[PDB]
C-alpha cells in the first residue's frame, strides 16, 4: 500500500495557488510513483501537458481518453486512464472498446478507471456522467477477472473511506500478484494509509487529493504520506 498523488484540472487550472507543473515537479522530486493527472471537462489539455512534460513518462493522464488520442498522450504520460469512453451514453459497457485500447497501448500503459456507487449493502455499481448515470457494469470478482485480461491497473473511484469496498477489492483480486489497484475515495486522514494496508493486506494503494496541505486542505500532510511510502520500500 502506497500513497498515490493526483492533480485535478478544471478550466485549465489545478483544483485546489500553484500551476500544474509545480505539483508534477514535487511528485517527481519526492519519487511518488503512479500519480494521476485528471482533466475534468474541456480546455485542460495544455495544463495536462504542462504537468506531464515537467516530469516526462512519470505521471498518468485521464479525462477524455479514447482510441483516437491515447497514443499521443502516451508521448508524455506513463499510462493513460480510460473513463467514460468504455460506455455508451446510455451506460452500456463496451468490452470491445477496452480491447481496442489494449491493442493500441499495451496492457502496461492503460488504466481502467471505474467510478462506483454503493447501491445496496455489499453491492457497488459502476457510474458515469458525473455520477448521474448507473451503468450495466457491477464491481465484483467476475468483473475483475475479465477486465484484468486487458489492463495491469485499476483506479477505483468512490466521513471516512468505504472500508468494506477496500476489503472487497482485496477479496476480489487476492489471486492477482501483478495487478495494481488504486483507491480514490476521499481519504482525509494519514491513518487511512495503515488502514488500507490492513484491509487489503498491502495490495490496494490510496490516493490523497484535496485533503492535503499542498492543495490547501488542512487535514493531511503531504510529507507524512511521502514518509509512509519511504517506510514501505
Ligand atoms: Cl505509472
From Swiss-Prot:
- Listed as disulfide-bonded, the cysteine pairs are none
Q: Which InterPro entries match?
A: Aldolase_TIM, His6-like_euk, His_biosynth, Isoase_HisA-like, RibuloseP-bd_barrel
Subcellular localization is given as:
Cytoplasm
Pathway assignment reads: Amino-acid biosynthesis; L-histidine biosynthesis; L-histidine from 5-phospho-alpha-D-ribose 1-diphosphate: step 4/9
Keyword Isomerase applies: yes
State where it is primarily located: cytoplasm
Q: Keywords assigned by UniProt? A: Amino-acid biosynthesis, Cytoplasm, Histidine biosynthesis, Isomerase
Q: What class of enzyme is it?
A: isomerase
UniProt EC number: 5.3.1.16
GO molecular function term, any single one: 1-(5-phosphoribosyl)-5-[(5-phosphoribosylamino)methylideneamino]imidazole-4-carboxamide isomerase activity
User: What NCBIfam families does the database record attribute to this sequence?
Assistant: hisA_euk
PANTHER family xrefs: 1-(5-PHOSPHORIBOSYL)-5-[(5-PHOSPHORIBOSYLAMINO)METHYLIDENEAMINO] IMIDAZOLE-4-CARBOXAMIDE ISOMERASE
The similarity comment for this entry is:
Belongs to the HisA/HisF family.
- This chain belongs to which protein, by name? 1-(5-phosphoribosyl)-5-[(5-phosphoribosylamino)methylideneamino] imidazole-4-carboxamide isomerase
Q: Say which species the protein is native to.
A: Saccharomyces cerevisiae (strain ATCC 204508 / S288c)
Amino acid at each position: 500500500t502506497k500513497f498515490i498523488g493526483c492533480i485535478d484540472l478544471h478550466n485549465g487550472e489545478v483544483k485546489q495557488q500553484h500551476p500544474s507543473s509545480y505539483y508534477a515537479k514535487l511528485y517527481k522530486d519526492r519519487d511518488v510513483q503512479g500519480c494521476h493527472v485528471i482533466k475534468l471537462g474541456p480546455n485542460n489539455d495544455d495544463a495536462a501537458r504542462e504537468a506531464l512534460q515537467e516530469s516526462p513518462q512519470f505521471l498518468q493522464v485521464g479525462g477524455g481518453i479514447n482510441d483516437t488520442n491515447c497514443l499521443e498522450w502516451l508521448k508524455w504520460a506513463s499510462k493513460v486512464i480510460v473513463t467514460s469512453w468504455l460506455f455508451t451514453k446510455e451506460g452500456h459497457f463496451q468490452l470491445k472498446r477496452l480491447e481496442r485500447l489494449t491493442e493500441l497501448c499495451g496492457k502496461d500503459r492503460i488504466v481502467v478507471d471505474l467510478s462506483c456507487r454503493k447501491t445496496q449493502d455489499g453491492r457497488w455499481i459502476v457510474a458515469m456522467n458525473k455520477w448521474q448515470t448507473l451503468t450495466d457494469l457491477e464491481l465484483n470478482a467476475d468483473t475483475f477477472r475479465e477486465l484484468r485480461k486487458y489492463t495491469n491497473e485499476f483506479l477505483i473511484h468512490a466521513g471516512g473511506i468505504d472500508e468494506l469496498l477496500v476489503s472487497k477489492l482485496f477479496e476480489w483480486t487476492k489471486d492477482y500478484d501483478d495487478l495494481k489497484i488504486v483507491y480514490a475515495g476521499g481519504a482525509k486522514s494519514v491513518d487511512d494509509l495503515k488502514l488500507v494496508d490492513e484491509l487489503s493486506h498491502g495490495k490496494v494503494d490510496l490516493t490523497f487529493g484535496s485533503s492535503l496541505d499542498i492543495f490547501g486542505g488542512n487535514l493531511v500532510k503531504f510529507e507524512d504520506c511521502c514518509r509512509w511510502n519511504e517506510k514501505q520500500g
